[PDB]
Each structure stands twice: as C-alpha cells, then as structure tokens.
Coordinates of N, CA and C in Angstrom, one line a residue:
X1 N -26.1 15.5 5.3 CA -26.5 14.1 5.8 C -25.5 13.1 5.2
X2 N -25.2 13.3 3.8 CA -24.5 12.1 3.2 C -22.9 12.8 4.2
X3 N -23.0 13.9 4.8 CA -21.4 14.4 5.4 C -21.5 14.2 6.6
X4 N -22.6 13.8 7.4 CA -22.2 13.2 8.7 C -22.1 11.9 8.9
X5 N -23.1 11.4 8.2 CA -23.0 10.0 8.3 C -21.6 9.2 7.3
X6 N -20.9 9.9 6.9 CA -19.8 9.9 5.9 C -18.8 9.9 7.0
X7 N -18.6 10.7 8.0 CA -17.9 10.8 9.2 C -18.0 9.8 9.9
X8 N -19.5 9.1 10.2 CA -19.9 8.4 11.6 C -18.7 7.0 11.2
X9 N -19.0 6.7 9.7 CA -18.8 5.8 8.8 C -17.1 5.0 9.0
X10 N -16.6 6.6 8.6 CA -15.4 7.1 8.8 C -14.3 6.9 10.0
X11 N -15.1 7.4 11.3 CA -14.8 6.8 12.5 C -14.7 5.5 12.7
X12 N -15.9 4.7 12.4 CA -16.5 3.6 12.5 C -15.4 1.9 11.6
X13 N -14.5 2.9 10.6 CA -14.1 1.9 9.6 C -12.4 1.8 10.2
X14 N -12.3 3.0 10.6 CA -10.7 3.1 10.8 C -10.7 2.8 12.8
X15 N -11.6 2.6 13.1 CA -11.5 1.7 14.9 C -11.7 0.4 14.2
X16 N -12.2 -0.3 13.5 CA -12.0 -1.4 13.1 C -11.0 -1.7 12.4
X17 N -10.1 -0.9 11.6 CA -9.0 -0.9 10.8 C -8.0 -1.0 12.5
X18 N -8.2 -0.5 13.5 CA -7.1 -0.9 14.6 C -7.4 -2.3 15.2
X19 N -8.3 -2.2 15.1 CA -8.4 -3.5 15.8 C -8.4 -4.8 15.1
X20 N -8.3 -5.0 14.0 CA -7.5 -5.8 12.7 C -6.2 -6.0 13.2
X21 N -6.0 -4.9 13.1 CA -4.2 -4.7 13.3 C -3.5 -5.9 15.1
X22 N -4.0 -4.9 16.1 CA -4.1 -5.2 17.0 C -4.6 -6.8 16.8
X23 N -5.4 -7.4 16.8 CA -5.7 -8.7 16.5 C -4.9 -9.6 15.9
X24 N -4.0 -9.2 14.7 CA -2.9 -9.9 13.6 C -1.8 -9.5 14.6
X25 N -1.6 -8.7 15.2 CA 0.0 -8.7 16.2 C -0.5 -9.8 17.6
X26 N -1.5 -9.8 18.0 CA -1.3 -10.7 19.0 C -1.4 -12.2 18.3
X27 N -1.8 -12.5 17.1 CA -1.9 -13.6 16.7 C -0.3 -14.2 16.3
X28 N 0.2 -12.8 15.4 CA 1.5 -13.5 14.4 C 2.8 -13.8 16.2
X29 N 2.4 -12.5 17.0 CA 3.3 -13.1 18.3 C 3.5 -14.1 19.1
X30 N 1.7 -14.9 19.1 CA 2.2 -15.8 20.0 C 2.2 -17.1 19.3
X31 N 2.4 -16.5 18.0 CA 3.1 -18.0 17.0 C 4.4 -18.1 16.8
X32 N 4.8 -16.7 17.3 CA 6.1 -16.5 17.5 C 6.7 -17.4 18.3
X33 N 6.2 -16.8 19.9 CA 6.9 -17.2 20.8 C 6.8 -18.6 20.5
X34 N 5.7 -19.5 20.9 CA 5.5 -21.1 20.6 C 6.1 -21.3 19.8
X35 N 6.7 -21.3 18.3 CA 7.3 -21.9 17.8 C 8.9 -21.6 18.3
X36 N 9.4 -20.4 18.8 CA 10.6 -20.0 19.3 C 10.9 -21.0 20.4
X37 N 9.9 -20.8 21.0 CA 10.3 -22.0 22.7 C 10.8 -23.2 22.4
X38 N 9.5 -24.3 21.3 CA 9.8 -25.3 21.2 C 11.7 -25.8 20.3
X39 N 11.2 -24.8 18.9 CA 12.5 -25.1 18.7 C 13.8 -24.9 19.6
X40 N 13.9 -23.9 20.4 CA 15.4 -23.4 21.2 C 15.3 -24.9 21.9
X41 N 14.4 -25.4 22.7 CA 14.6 -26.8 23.0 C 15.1 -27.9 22.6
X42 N 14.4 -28.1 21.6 CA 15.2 -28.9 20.4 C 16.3 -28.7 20.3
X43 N 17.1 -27.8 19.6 CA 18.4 -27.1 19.5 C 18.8 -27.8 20.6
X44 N 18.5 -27.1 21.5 CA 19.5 -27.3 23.0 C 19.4 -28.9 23.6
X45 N 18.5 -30.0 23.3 CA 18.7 -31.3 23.5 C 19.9 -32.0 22.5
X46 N 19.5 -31.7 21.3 CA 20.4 -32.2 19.8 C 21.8 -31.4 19.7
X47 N 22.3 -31.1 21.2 CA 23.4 -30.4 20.6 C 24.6 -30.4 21.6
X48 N 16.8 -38.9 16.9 CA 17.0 -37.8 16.6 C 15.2 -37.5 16.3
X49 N 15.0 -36.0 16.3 CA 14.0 -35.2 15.9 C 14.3 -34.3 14.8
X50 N 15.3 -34.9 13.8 CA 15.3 -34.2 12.5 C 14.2 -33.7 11.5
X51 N 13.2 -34.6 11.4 CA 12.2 -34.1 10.6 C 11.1 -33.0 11.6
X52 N 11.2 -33.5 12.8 CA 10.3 -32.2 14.0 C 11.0 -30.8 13.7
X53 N 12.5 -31.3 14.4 CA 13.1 -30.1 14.2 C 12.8 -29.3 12.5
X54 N 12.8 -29.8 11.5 CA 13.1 -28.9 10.2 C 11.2 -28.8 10.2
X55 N 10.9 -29.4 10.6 CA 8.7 -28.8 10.9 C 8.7 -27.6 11.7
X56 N 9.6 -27.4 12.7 CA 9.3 -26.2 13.1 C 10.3 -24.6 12.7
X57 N 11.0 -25.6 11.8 CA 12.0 -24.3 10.9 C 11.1 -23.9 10.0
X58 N 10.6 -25.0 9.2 CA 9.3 -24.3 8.2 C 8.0 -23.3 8.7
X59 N 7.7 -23.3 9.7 CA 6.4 -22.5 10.5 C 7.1 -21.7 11.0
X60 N 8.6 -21.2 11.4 CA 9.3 -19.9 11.9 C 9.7 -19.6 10.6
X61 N 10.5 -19.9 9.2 CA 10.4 -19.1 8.4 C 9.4 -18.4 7.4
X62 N 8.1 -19.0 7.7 CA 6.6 -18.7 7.3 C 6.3 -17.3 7.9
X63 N 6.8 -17.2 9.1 CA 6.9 -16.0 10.0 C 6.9 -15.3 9.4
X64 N 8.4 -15.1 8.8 CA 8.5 -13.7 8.6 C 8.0 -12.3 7.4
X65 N 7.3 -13.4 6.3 CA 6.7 -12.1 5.9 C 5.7 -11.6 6.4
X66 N 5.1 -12.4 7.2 CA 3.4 -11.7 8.2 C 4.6 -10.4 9.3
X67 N 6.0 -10.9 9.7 CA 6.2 -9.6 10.6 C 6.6 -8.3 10.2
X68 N 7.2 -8.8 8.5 CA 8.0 -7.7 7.9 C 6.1 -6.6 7.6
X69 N 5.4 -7.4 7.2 CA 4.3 -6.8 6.5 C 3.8 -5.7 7.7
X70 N 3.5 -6.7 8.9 CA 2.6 -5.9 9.8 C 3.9 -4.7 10.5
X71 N 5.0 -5.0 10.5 CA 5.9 -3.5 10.9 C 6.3 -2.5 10.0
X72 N 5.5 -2.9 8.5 CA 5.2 -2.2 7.4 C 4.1 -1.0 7.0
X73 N 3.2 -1.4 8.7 CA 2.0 -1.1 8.4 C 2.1 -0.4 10.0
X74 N 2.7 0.0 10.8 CA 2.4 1.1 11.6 C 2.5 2.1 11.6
X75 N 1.5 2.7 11.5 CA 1.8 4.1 11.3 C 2.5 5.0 12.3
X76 N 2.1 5.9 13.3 CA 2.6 6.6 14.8 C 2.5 5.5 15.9
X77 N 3.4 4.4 16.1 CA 3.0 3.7 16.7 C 4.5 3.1 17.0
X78 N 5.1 3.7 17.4 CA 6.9 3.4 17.6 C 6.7 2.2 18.5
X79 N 5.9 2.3 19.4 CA 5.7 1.2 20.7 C 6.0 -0.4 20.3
X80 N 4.4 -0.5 19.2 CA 3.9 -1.4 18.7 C 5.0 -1.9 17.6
X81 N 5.8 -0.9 17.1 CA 7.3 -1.1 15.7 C 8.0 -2.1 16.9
X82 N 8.5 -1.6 17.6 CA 9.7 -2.4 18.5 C 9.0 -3.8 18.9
X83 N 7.8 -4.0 19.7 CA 7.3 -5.2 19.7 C 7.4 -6.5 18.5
X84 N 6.8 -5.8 17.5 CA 7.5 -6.4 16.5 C 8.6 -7.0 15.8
X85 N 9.6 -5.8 15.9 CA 11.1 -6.3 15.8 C 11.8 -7.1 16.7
X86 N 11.4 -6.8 18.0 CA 11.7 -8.1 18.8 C 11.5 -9.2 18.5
X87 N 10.3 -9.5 18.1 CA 9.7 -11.1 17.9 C 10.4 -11.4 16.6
X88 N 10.5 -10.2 16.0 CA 11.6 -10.8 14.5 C 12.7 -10.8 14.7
X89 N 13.6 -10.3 15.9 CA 14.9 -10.6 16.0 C 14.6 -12.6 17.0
X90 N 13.9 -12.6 17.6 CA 13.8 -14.0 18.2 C 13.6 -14.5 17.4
X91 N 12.8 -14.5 16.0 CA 12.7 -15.7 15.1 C 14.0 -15.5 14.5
X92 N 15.1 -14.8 14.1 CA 16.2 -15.2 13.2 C 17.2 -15.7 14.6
X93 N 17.1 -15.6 15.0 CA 17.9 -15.9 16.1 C 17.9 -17.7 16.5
X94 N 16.4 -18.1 16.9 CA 16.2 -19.4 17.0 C 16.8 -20.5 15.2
X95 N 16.4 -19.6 13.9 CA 16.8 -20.2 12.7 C 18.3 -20.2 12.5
X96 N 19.1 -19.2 13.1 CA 20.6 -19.1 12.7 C 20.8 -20.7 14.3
X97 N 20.1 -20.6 14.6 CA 20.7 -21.5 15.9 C 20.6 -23.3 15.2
X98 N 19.3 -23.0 14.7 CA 19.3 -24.4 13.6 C 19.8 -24.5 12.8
X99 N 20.1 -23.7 12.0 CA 21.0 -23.9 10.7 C 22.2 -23.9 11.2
X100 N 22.9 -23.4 11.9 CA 24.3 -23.7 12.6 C 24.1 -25.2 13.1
X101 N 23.7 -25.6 14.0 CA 23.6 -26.9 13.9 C 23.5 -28.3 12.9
X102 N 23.1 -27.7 11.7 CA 22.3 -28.8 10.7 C 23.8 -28.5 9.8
X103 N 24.3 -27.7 9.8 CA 26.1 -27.6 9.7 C 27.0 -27.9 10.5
X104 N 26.5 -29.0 11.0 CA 27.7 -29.1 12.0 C 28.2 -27.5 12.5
X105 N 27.3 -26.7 13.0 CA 28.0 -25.4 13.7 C 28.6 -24.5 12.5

C-alpha cells in the first residue's frame, strides 16, 4: 500500500513537475517577444525615448537568467531546448542593437 500509493504519488508529482515547466516557458516567451517587438521599434525610430528605451533594456536583460535556467532544465526534450535558444538568441540580438546605438554604433 505505502508502494502503490507511493507510485500514484509519483506519477501525480512529476505531470505537475511538466506542467510548471511548460507554464514558466510560455510565460518567460511571451515576455520575450513583447519586450523584443517594442524595443526593435524603438531602435529602428531613434536611428528622444532614452529613459523608455534603457526600461526596456533592463526587463530584456532580466531575461536571461530565467532562459539560461529553464534550458538548464530540459531533460529529453531537444524540441522545447531550441525554442528556447531562439528566444535567447532574439533577446541578445535586440540588446547588441541598443547598445550599438547608445555608442554611437
């Protein structure tokens, strides 16, 4: 008894352990994109909203240890890895585009 219900338990903890997961990637994504969209706009008008622009640098470099962590944490799930790395290659991408700018290029 304490070995089946030790299973049911078992089952029961690690479908909720996915769906955590699953939950925290659609959340850190579409904070991704939103902050990616607005800033590339910015960028691309300014090239003033200097203090907007450097507000949305601070919430895209906040990013990235929620994306390093959660593509830290996939186990057999290559799919869900690349998803990830995408959204992390669009956040360093939109930051190298501001910081180039805030240098004069």
């Amino acid at each position: 008894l304490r070995a089946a219900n030790k299973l049911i338990k078992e089952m029961v903890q690690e479908d909720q352990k996915r769906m955590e997961k699953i939950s925290k990637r659609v959340n850190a994504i579409e904070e991704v994109n939103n902050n990616v969209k607005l800033l590339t706009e910015m960028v691309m008008s300014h090239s003033s909203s200097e203090d907007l622009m450097k507000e949305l640098y601070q919430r895209c470099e906040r990013m990235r240890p929620t994306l390093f962590r959660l593509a830290s944490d996939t186990e057999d799930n290559d799919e869900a890895l690349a998803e990830i790395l995408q959204a992390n290659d669009n956040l360093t991408q939109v930051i190298n585009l501001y910081k180039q700018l805030v240098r004069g290029e």
